[model samples]
Target chain A: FTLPVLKISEMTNSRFPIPVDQMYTSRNENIVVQPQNGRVTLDGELQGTTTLQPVSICGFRGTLQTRLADQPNYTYQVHLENLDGSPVDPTDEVPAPLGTPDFQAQLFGVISQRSSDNATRAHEARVNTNDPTFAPQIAQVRFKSPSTDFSDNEPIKFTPVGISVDSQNSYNQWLLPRYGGHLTNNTHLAPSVSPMFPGEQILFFRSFMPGAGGFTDGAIDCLLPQEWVAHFYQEAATAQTDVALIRFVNPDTGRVLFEGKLHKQGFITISNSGDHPIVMPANGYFRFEAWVKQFYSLAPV
Target chain B: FTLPVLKISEMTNSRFPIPVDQMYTSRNENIVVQPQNGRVTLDGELQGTTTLQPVSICGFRGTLQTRLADQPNYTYQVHLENLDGSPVDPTDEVPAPLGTPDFQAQLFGVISQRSSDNATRAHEARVNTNDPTFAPQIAQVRFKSPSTDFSDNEPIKFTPVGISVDSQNSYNQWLLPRYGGHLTNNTHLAPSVSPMFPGEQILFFRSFMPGAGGFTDGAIDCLLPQEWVAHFYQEAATAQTDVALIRFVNPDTGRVLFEGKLHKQGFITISNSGDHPIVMPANGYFRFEAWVKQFYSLAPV
Candidate 1:
């Protein structure tokens, strides 16, 4: 049998800090690779230019291929997921890491200032527990401006622009802060039912203000698709130190961004955790808006 | 008969080419249109822009709608094969010029120069009867060049270059002509059997000269996908001349444009159509090449 010959000496400048001719062992076998030969190695450590198509795996490190593998300087890498490159064998063990838990937004409503606390129910935007994910930025927005026919079904192909709710600072961030655990129960804003479940998906969409002659009352509407989410922000001409408006209206036009149907339908406002009673003042003309955000993930999975 | 209210002097720059209230009749219908509209019309004799959406065809035109018909300037058209702008009556008869006809290529082969005249085969780039179309262009040139990592199954993705056979010009056209329906059967380069069918797809892919260290005599291999046909073109060191080489080989290095597999794969020359006894002369060292042409169809079906 021909014995393998190896030499270790001065280090050559390389992407890897390994010798030209070296031998290593993986869980399954033994591997020897040379600088001039094909690329590849056992356990796929740092093979410079050679490829190591395992002649076989598991024990004998598959027959160590020739000096050359996939290429003259190919890099062979074996992944070690648990940090420190150590190998572990199979044994009786318990599965610890579990699946993910679902998080939700606090669903609430904002009523009309002119009506009694009882009159506010008609103006409510309600989110039930059954559906709890922000659904804007989900499907493409489906409202159009200046529609002549309003017959054919085409999506509102235009880009959206959001306004600031607070005069103190303009942070129209889409994803809002979580519900403030301190709000106690949403008793300030009257609910149809007493004490609605708090966490759910919060959203903002376009709608027209009632009785406006087709003015720009782009109502922010909702439901479905996971791409878009919203956090309640502050909006009003007053910028009062304490309460927030449930919904926003264009202060100059006295209209909500809606399909002019809110003239028949009322408006509703929801909030994140904390900031008590995102309330509409007794004598305030309020207009509101919020920011939207999108998320993505990357890297070798 | 009421006269159309003509107010021609004061021309209002209307969006429509015709009057917004214009009434017109196509052979198939009496159409009325008011404002904004645009469709298609046919059964015409050079009427530009105006449309003719046929309401009822063959006999008397349909009644005109007082207001807009389909729509003002509505474009309507039909699909009957003739070009006379004449409408045909629908009767109990067979629809002529329907669907399509099948056009296929003939498949055949050539053999080695040293082989006995009786040993050539008709089925070289083999294709069975049931499958007629060339599979999508597939296969990799099994040649190794300065390619660093050959481990990955890389496919040949190069734009092809075709050389001509004529000594007078250069046209790397992709397709070539076959023996214009004359040579009833291939006899000279005899197949194992005496007779064989004709009409087929001929092709040329990359190859290299014999003795080249990094190549597989990659026969211009074929299978699956659309097929391309070719005729012998003219080429020379003079870059002009009338002759054809079955499989081209580089003389200086004896390599074909291929990665060099033909190193062991010898080269052979076939005579132009009409020439007999395609024999290679010993004292005469020769050179061969050709131009290929590709064809395509586009626009309205």
Candidate 2:
């Protein structure tokens, strides 16, 4: 049996913010969606202005209508539209299944595909409303291309799903599980003895004032898992006449991971420039002298 | 000139959550606080239960009183307490300054010094309400060593700040700038030519199903900064019969960072096992196979 599909109206009347739906914090910014004259028009934030940033809403045509029963309140519905400009009869509806994001969600999934880089995806295309990396600010559908004319106003062009600027098209294949859709467990048999079991690991990078700790300066100890390999570097450092020093030493074995003294004005020097993966015992004393500025890169393996 | 200090009452009735204030999501679990017997008695979340986790409220004392004018409404106050069991007349209040966390914050910071591991700090002592690593749960300070009496109730013990269980104490010296308190500019002049200028960097780790993207499965491209160095490994992998393969290739330079195939039942092989920091230029095409299970680690340098 096939799972039921969510009707286009299910989205327009959604009580929730349509999970996975994307929107610019400001009304007139990157993309805009609002009720127009008897229809919901989707266009650039500044549709009337000449400064519209080159943008497009890829896949899924817009289907809007007024309230049917209680009041004829206007709201727009949506469904997948074909890439070609031909007006197709039967519209494609979003699939409803367990653990899948709502209709508006799958629409946002198209945004991620627009950006090729992971970092870029976080910056431009995606924003976790829960914990945004960027300030909530300037924050997609049908494939409709109007002929270029001397006229400035034109319907926002819509690109097909999975169709890359480089001409690669996967059609509906790419949109299925790209959003918040959960995947079924796909586990295969495995040998009892594995070659390597990647242990607990962490990539840490933080900056702080070296002198902030004062007399208790060098006494900070850090505990680690058994047989942990650590790779670290003094990413950035600053100071006055006083030098900043840091040491990673195993309290029990007296093994020194590495040590270095950083300076600026009077003299300058550095230690451990390249890959020195040192296996440290549990609970290492990470001592540092106050009076300088520095950032460290330490990660477990 | 010295900065003014925030009064103890600034905490008990502050409008904010007392920036850096830690609280258990649920009412009573790990740590508990409430007004009791015309006084605020800081005690365990389960003050009346035997299942109370071993806990302590190191370094602060509580003072309570009725309102001065508004009908003498009762409220409690707080301040740094001497480790020695004595009612030190003069109490150390938190310093007030721009960019520095408020009074209660330093108290929450006392929590971090209690743990000796970076990961433990996140799990037990520290939590960024802004972006928590762990689910907000059992969420400290003046040292009060109560006698082992037959009675079931006892005031929470308060250990001195900076004093570790190993008998090391920095007293008040340890409390400064440990929390959200920002440090003043400490920049020293630098020579014209520097040994190193750490460029942009990021650490990324995310899990997703290999088959999620379907036919467009391997078309994901990630753009990195020029001269980007990446270190990654298939941290974890599970499969049915199909193998999962991932390749990091510099689209511009045509350089392959590394390629590996993960398998289980049918066959198993591993690749790129050590320190392989490959420098990638511009945009990189990361192709992968669907119908498998796996996790990859990638980071920038």
Candidate 3:
């Protein structure tokens, strides 16, 4: 029953226009969690009560972020992190029955403008608000059930789950335009070109299953077999059915040009009103890593 | 001295087709001389040299033999015919008093054959002497008299004496194509085709002029002053003075192609052959014409 090899890490702040250095690593350590202080987490056992099915994998700059929370009827609980403050070794034991895991996730966010709604109504009409605005650009996560204990109203059900990009650092260099990130910029970050430099390194992988009657036979029985949820939905539908590889390295002429490949295959329900049927587990899987310095300047409108 | 209004007409085989209603009638009683069948003379007056000079004009066709020769060196007069016919009327007029004019001629009994340097032995000897052989052409006529009462031992120099073909109806249609008399082979003749079509209401004129000490002052004097040779050669050295209006029709319908005009110029030579400087006047200008039933042909090559 292997499955506990997490080692998440994070640090943000540079998006393109050169000069960068980032490093992120993970192999599952209870799916790392830090939550707050620039936020970080794997699936902190979901807080509220929703049928969550947490699955997180994050890597900075050179892009990689997977956060899935199917709050099937809300019974949240899942988290993981590692930003600076460090402290996650209470005998870190994610090595049991974790085998059938292979979940995959993806969540991206950005919509700041002082958390806009016209700047939160000009700071609630105190009026002197300068004009910066942000709208619903979302990202939320939660999932918990090392065994069952779900119950919010427990109706839960969700099945649009497939997201890939990480065939060992499946490159798409952040999403290209010189270091990815430009799907018409609804800005979910990642586009400052930092695919590692200064201390270069990167990796990302994803997988998830449990899509059909996501567990209930004896309420998650032994916690793994349900045919490992069809073997993690056939290895995350065969790694989101290919087409997703990206590589990097020109952090200032180390010239790598984000090694080609790209594909995502559906699923973008950031936070669907708390939960609907987020039953992830079936050997859930998600992995990502990052590091890189400069390179990225796509701005011409 | 009025000059320039000349006219001479006379052609007949009993008017064997000369009626274009009398070409240009000016009445010498509608001018019709048969002196035994052919006669037309203008300039050296045969029937009154009729005034005419802007270089007289032309029109004449075959048979007009004026004979009165006493050999001896000065009975002076003879016009036998063919003077080597074939456009050989470089102005046709010979009364013998000036020299240089032997553009070869022929007629004493008429046998003529030569032209066979093998084109299949001259088309098989012109089909075995049914004769159309051709090619023995000449037209000469000289008489520049430094009068010793004529040839006092070649002193009436410039001699060559006479040769003419003004019109015995174009010398009996140029010997009806060489003798056996053709309307298409009565027995021989029939091949004189090198430019000799004196029939079609004739119009021939030739007048080239340049050269003659640019109009002589060193005279063989007799009215030598066309404005002093147009002001002493106003820059002399000329020839090819351009005057070629040739038209000889019906080579299978090129109709009206038998009109002619030539007028070369320049003159000199007088005072006994040794009075020196003859001053250009040997075959000075030129003009020719012939019209008898206005040309029509279908057979006789």
lDDT of each: 0.16, 0.19, 0.18
Which window of 10 residues has the lowest lDDT sum in candidate 1 chain A?
A: A225-234
Question: Model 2, B66-134: lDDT tens per residue?
Answer: 112331122111232222223433211212111111112211111111112211110011111112111
| Better model by TM-score: candidate 1 vs candidate 2 | 2
Q: Interface Cα RMSD for all candidates?
A: 42.6, 23.6, 61.9
- Per-residue accuracy of model 2 over A89-205 as CA lDDT, tens digit each: 322221211111111211111111111221111000111111211110111111111111111211111111111111121112111222211232112111111111122111111
Per-residue alpha-carbon lDDT of model 3 for A1-301, expressed as tens digits?
A: 1111111111111111000112222222222221111111112121111111111112110111222245333223212222111222223222101111111222111100111111110000000001011111111123322223222321121111112222222212122111111122222221111122222222222112111111111011011111122123223333423223333333334343333222222111111122123332222222222211133211110
Docking class of 1: incorrect
Model 1 alpha-carbon drift over 4 Å, by segment:
A1-301, B1-203, B206-301
Residue B191 miss distance in model 3 (angstroms): 99
List TM-scores for all candidates, in order: 0.11, 0.17, 0.12
lDDT ranking from best candidate downward:
2, 3, 1
Q: What's the TM for model 1?
A: 0.11
TM-score of chain B of each: 0.14, 0.20, 0.16
lDDT (Cα, 0-100) at A170 in candidate 3? 22
